Structure 1
Amino acid sequence: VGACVLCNSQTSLRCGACIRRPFLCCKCCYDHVISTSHKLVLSVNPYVCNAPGCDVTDVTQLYLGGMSYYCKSHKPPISFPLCANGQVFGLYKNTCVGSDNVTDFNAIATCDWTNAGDYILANTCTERLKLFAAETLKATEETFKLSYGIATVREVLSDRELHLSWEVGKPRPPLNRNYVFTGYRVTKNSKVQIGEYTFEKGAVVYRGTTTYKLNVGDYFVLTSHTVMPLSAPTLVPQEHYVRITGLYPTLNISDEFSSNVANYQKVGMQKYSTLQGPPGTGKSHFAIGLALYYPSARIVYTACSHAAVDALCEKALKYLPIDKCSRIIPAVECFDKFKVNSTLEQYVFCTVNALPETTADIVVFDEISMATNYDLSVVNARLRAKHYVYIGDPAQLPAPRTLLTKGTLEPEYFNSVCRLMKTIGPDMFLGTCRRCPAEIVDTVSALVYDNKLKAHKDKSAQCFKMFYKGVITHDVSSAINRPQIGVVREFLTRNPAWRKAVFISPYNSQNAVASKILGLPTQTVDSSQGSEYDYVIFTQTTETAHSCNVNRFNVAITRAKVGILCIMSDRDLYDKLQFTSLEIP
């Protein structure tokens, strides 16, 4: 009994075949219920026939006969069609505006989340429809994943090694760090707490959260939520006022904040200044230096997951007193610099899944590109701050959409903020990148990065390029091709001083296989933001649309500030990047 989604009018009718059960006014409901695959409408009572044994539940056919609603084959003479005038029968029949062009909502309703175009329309429409599309997308996500293979491991191989059995008739979903399960312990009646763990190459090896000893009888699933409706938009309306509103001018600053002063003012002088960030330019330092500039401000540490606020926790030990902060964690093993559940404290350390709804001055939204509109708009519901801070950039990598099937999402459509830096521009500019030497930062410039990144140090002269040979063979979800592994080990013998690296690969199963032959650790490309090594190892292994994507590989290119080896089965970036090439054994 509230406003409908497309008309802002009080109604009482809900699409029965939708997933959200949204409010739709009488003419607006007629439009949607004739123009799509939504065939049912519910009111204060469900518009269904009352003759025992009826299951035809369309919209037009039903007939109202007093204290009941019939079908034409169920109908005593005193009646009227429930569908007439192009207007379904329900409360507030008059004062509904309706809408003629509702094919956008119609497509969102019929959008089954397979094509890229689904995401394109879902990110091109207006606000509350943005919300409807987002929540339908996440609901369909959990319909997708939970109904797949049961993680019923029916024996233990060895220490951190298991034997696997899975659901029949329904296939089994990936076993990667992008896909985290959740444990339930069976007793003679029901289930008990186990927790979330990951599976990898074994014969199943599990990268467990913490120590556990499970015998037979146990099995796992990846649990989810029951996502409820939201409240607020993706962002607040902008400002162009005259004041640094709500805060206090400055006396002290450290001169390493020289590039910090110029952008402090713009974030607080107007509603929001949306931050774009190249890898390792000092953004978190800036996001910590915000409170350094004004000791009196409340700024709310957010992220995609806690592991990035743990980064803002790591540098919290560096700068600010521990008596003004609180690290909120839901009732998991993460970083905790402070005490939990102290909301009323100045510094708010949490993530989008943690903080209770309050009000604050500035919210430091971290790693935006790995967030979709839903988790982007939640804090807009929880926290009505006057100023926003969006640490992130669509330029790095988007959140894992398992329904990426046909096409690939461009950073124009990762979220609304993601095209916002591409429509109004980034209201952020930091040219001093402490990450990379004269090789990479100069190279990432012409890549996508606005020709704004350029050298800080000189050339370290070992960040070389080597384009490879390439042969293709896949098994389930990634590929193992020791051809791409062969030159790694065989050219490493030329440099024994090359044992300080990590072997990253787009095919996450390669690191689990390569470590048997190579010994350097593992790392997943898409969840590798923030972490860097001095010397790094990679093989692109192909130039399909998953890894070497010109905006999306660039997390692991700015990895090295000393030396790299970019093994290329590729043409995407070789003649595009700016390094030197050697011979292949």
Structure 2
Amino acid sequence: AVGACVLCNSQTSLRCGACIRRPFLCCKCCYDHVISTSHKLVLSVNPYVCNAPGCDVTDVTQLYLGGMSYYCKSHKPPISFPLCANGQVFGLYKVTDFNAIATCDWTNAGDYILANTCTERLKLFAAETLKATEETFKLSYGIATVREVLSDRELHLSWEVGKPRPPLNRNYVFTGYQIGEYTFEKDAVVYRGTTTYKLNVGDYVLTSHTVMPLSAPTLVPQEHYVRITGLYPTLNISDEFSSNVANYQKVGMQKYSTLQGPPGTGKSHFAIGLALYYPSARIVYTACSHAAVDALCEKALKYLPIDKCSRIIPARARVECFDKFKVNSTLEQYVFCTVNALPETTADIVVFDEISMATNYDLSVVNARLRAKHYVYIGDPAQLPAPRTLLTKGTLEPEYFNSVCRLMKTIGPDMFLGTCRRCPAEIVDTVSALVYDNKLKAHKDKSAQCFKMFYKGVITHDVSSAINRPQIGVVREFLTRNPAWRKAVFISPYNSQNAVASKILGLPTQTVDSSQGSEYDYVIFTQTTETAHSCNVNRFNVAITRAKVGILCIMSDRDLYDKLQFTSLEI
């Protein structure tokens, strides 16, 4: 019951009992929370409530200080002072944005906009409130019961009555009962057991968690040094990494640094190269996803001592991680760990990659568990953000993804990798104009294997996941005449479309959001629909920037189709 205001940092003992995170408020600000919102319960060592028997008066605007206890207007003694007096609430040591953040439901984009345009402490209140609201609601979907078990990879499901049903994507992970975590893909449903337990009938919940509080800021205050501080540069750096030396120096002359790395521009190369320039430094490589850390591991396995590297895995192990480094050895000079599994340690340089996919919660967790001399944030605000499962009204723009992306979109990034080495020029040219203001350059020539076709087709829906069978049919007609594409990866914005494409075409499939950070020779993309999800420029950017040799885009949107600097196909 001891703390300081979360708005002006004035110590007090008053906590709001209506806020889900019960923050500490001083006497001057508590008055504005209570007199401007619906939040009227104030908490202290003793609940501010009428102490008279049988009274339900909890509104502090209706309460009075009588003697040492608190009473309402119908029970207060003659000599009593109003608790809410002189723009203050009685407490020891005797706001609009805070009010919005405290009263919002996190379903509108404006909520997330405020949560990133506010003060740091407010940013941390919003983050923890959001996570809480996300969790307190994950308990309101129906439960799953197995009708019949057909194969080892497919089941029949029966859903509970009264509650809504959660979608069947990997984003919606489930805990089985403790038979292990499970994911489902949309009659028959495909099941994926983190273990090889033969899911039987009579078996049966959405994963959840407990919102631990936060303490560290999203970004530590910036520090600009006069020279490389805390690190010892080499003087014989491989020529393969020589282009990044001027950037590798800025990292050492600053507390934190921002790198915008468009697709195929060499982000992982910059990351592992930072260690070769500082060969004595302890480096923690972290990201929110397991695939990102594994990508950084695979890159290290080529340029770094395989004996100074460790892949930290959570004891609760769902996906397969990297199995070529020492597992769970925090003592190594090179530690590769997801944010949630971060140990409480120290380092010289911390590298946080895939920053577009980070939440302000993740950023705080890192600035806490990891105390370091230099933090490096690598990503691209023109790529996809982390899913905000409560956001249903409005679109979150890149400047509101997190604090780092806001910086990259407002003041600019500290470093910008401007040469794409992966994609054919046709792709590079298209994205450079679409999201990079023509600042992205192409190293490769035009492949002449980048084609586009405008075909709206027919849109069917499995619940809400979209499907366009006619667009799959067009792809089938294309594969019969382009054999070199039988190895192509099918990519779409919809899981259901991918499922239908797997069966009809036989190609490996991937959603755009799951394709992020992956590269492929040939890519086949069907927009499937003309929706805000299907036409998002970040999503379209990621999708087409996956191809190294060729791409075929079956388009549903006239604008994005015209912008594709590809050869048009007819059929």
Which TM-score applies when normalising by structure 2? 0.95
Say whether the 8 Å CA contact 1:274–1:388 is kept in structure 2: no
Say whether the 8 Å CA contact 1:178–1:527 is kept in structure 2: no
Give how far 1:133 is off.
Answer: 0.6
Say whether the 8 Å CA contact 2:497–2:528 is kept in structure 1: no
CA distance 1:303–1:76, change in 2 (3 Å) = same
Say whether the 8 Å CA contact 1:543–1:572 is kept in structure 2: no
Aligned equivalents of 2:537 and 2:559: distance in 1? 8
Secondary structure at 1:14's aligned position in 2? strand
Give how far 1:421 is off.
Answer: 1.4
Say whether the 8 Å CA contact 2:467–2:497 is kept in structure 1: yes
Q: Percent identity?
A: 100
Aligned equivalents of 2:465 and 2:523: distance in 1? 21
Aligned equivalents of 1:361 and 1:59: distance in 2? 50
Say whether the 8 Å CA contact 2:64–2:80 is kept in structure 1: yes
Give how far 1:251 is off.
Answer: 2.5
Aligned equivalents of 2:569 and 2:158: distance in 1? 47
The count of corresponding residues between Structure 1 and Structure 2 is: 566
Say whether the 8 Å CA contact 1:360–1:383 is kept in structure 2: yes
Give how far 1:488 is off.
Answer: 1.0
Listed one character per residue, the Cα deviations across residues 149-207 of structure 1 (whole Å, up to 9, x for unaligned) are 112334323332112122322101111022211223xxxxxxxx322221002522113
Q: Which residue is 1:322 aligned to?
A: 306
Say whether the 8 Å CA contact 1:505–1:538 is kept in structure 2: yes
Secondary structure at 2:149's aligned position in 1? strand
Listed one character per residue, the Cα deviations across residues 350-398 of structure 1 (whole Å, up to 9, x for unaligned) are 1111122222111110100011111112111122222121121111111
Say whether the 8 Å CA contact 2:169–2:185 is kept in structure 1: yes
CA distance 1:210–1:455, change in 2 (3 Å) = same
Secondary structure at 1:390's aligned position in 2? strand
Give how far 1:544 is off.
Answer: 1.8
Say whether the 8 Å CA contact 2:424–2:550 is kept in structure 1: no
Give how far 1:42 is off.
Answer: 0.7
Give how far 1:48 is off.
Answer: 2.0
Secondary structure at 1:275's aligned position in 2? strand
Q: Which moved more, 1:38-47 or 1:142-151?
A: 142-151
Q: Which moved more, 1:120-129 or 1:431-440?
A: 431-440
Q: Which residue is 2:296 aligned to?
A: 312
Q: Which moved more, 1:56-65 or 1:282-291?
A: 56-65
Give how far 1:76 is off.
Answer: 4.8
Secondary structure at 1:385's aligned position in 2? strand
Give how far 1:277 is off.
Answer: 0.7
Q: Which moved more, 1:120-129 or 1:526-535?
A: 526-535
Say whether the 8 Å CA contact 1:145–1:173 is kept in structure 2: no
Secondary structure at 1:105's aligned position in 2? helix
Listed one character per residue, the Cα deviations across residues 259-310 of structure 1 (whole Å, up to 9, x for unaligned) are 2222111111222220111112111111001111121111111001222111
Listed one character per residue, the Cα deviations across residues 436-471 of structure 1 (whole Å, up to 9, x for unaligned) are 122211222111113122222222211111111333
Judging by fraction of residues, say which structure has more strand. Answer: 2
Say whether the 8 Å CA contact 2:462–2:496 is kept in structure 1: no
CA distance 1:524–1:20, change in 2 (3 Å) = same
Computed over aligned residues only, the root mean square deviation of the Cα atoms, in angstroms, reads 1.8
Say whether the 8 Å CA contact 1:162–1:202 is kept in structure 2: no
Say whether the 8 Å CA contact 2:57–2:63 is kept in structure 1: no
CA distance 1:568–1:38, change in 2 (3 Å) = same
Q: Which residue is 1:37 aligned to?
A: 38
Say whether the 8 Å CA contact 1:441–1:558 is kept in structure 2: yes
Say whether the 8 Å CA contact 2:400–2:406 is kept in structure 1: yes
Aligned equivalents of 1:54 and 1:175: distance in 2? 48
Judging by fraction of residues, say which structure has more helix. Answer: 2
Say whether the 8 Å CA contact 2:468–2:529 is kept in structure 1: no
Aligned equivalents of 1:312 and 1:505: distance in 2? 26
Say whether the 8 Å CA contact 1:149–1:173 is kept in structure 2: yes
Q: Which moved more, 1:289-298 or 1:543-552?
A: 543-552
Q: Which moved more, 1:427-436 or 1:27-36?
A: 427-436
Aligned equivalents of 2:456 and 2:188: distance in 1? 31
Unaligned runs of 5+ in 2: none
Give how far 1:143 is off.
Answer: 1.9
Aligned equivalents of 1:22 and 1:323: distance in 2? 46
Aligned equivalents of 2:520 and 2:187: distance in 1? 26
Say whether the 8 Å CA contact 1:470–1:484 is kept in structure 2: yes
Listed one character per residue, the Cα deviations across residues 409-457 of structure 1 (whole Å, up to 9, x for unaligned) are 1101111211211222121132332211222112221111131222222
Aligned equivalents of 2:426 and 2:84: distance in 1? 69
Give how far 1:499 is off.
Answer: 1.1
Aligned equivalents of 1:240 and 1:64: distance in 2? 52
Say whether the 8 Å CA contact 2:287–2:353 is kept in structure 1: yes
Secondary structure at 1:359's aligned position in 2? strand
Say whether the 8 Å CA contact 2:429–2:442 is kept in structure 1: yes
Listed one character per residue, the Cα deviations across residues 38-59 of structure 1 (whole Å, up to 9, x for unaligned) are 1211110111233444434211
Aligned equivalents of 2:463 and 2:53: distance in 1? 50
Say whether the 8 Å CA contact 2:49–2:60 is kept in structure 1: no
Say whether the 8 Å CA contact 1:310–1:336 is kept in structure 2: no
Say whether the 8 Å CA contact 2:528–2:534 is kept in structure 1: no
Give how far 1:19 is off.
Answer: 0.5
Listed one character per residue, the Cα deviations across residues 93-151 of structure 1 (whole Å, up to 9, x for unaligned) are 2xxxxxxxx11111111121121111111111110000001111111111222221112
Say whether the 8 Å CA contact 2:146–2:200 is kept in structure 1: no
Secondary structure at 1:360's aligned position in 2? strand
Give how far 1:347 is off.
Answer: 1.1
Say whether the 8 Å CA contact 1:534–1:560 is kept in structure 2: yes
Secondary structure at 1:419's aligned position in 2? helix
Secondary structure at 1:55's aligned position in 2? coil
Give how far 1:405 is off.
Answer: 1.2
Give how far 1:67 is off.
Answer: 4.6
Aligned equivalents of 1:535 and 1:170: distance in 2? 43
Aligned equivalents of 2:411 and 2:59: distance in 1? 46
Say whether the 8 Å CA contact 1:548–1:572 is kept in structure 2: no
Say whether the 8 Å CA contact 1:20–1:135 is kept in structure 2: yes
Give how far 1:81 is off.
Answer: 2.8
Secondary structure at 2:185's aligned position in 1? strand
Secondary structure at 1:214's aligned position in 2? coil
Secondary structure at 2:440's aligned position in 1? coil
CA distance 1:115–1:263, change in 2 (3 Å) = same
Q: Which residue is 1:364 aligned to?
A: 351
Give how far 1:77 is off.
Answer: 4.5
Aligned equivalents of 1:48 and 1:210: distance in 2? 52
| Paired residues for 1:215-230 under 5 Å | 215-219=200-204, 221-230=205-214
Aligned equivalents of 1:314 and 1:151: distance in 2? 38
Secondary structure at 2:463's aligned position in 1? coil
Give how far 1:74 is off.
Answer: 3.8
CA distance 1:369–1:178, change in 2 (3 Å) = same
Say whether the 8 Å CA contact 2:399–2:410 is kept in structure 1: no
Q: Which moved more, 1:103-112 or 1:233-242?
A: 233-242
Aligned equivalents of 1:431 and 1:259: distance in 2? 12
CA distance 1:161–1:475, change in 2 (3 Å) = closer
| Paired residues for 1:385-464 under 5 Å | 385-464=372-451
Which TM-score applies when normalising by structure 1? 0.93
Secondary structure at 2:371's aligned position in 1? coil
Q: Which moved more, 1:208-217 or 1:533-542?
A: 208-217
Secondary structure at 2:517's aligned position in 1? coil
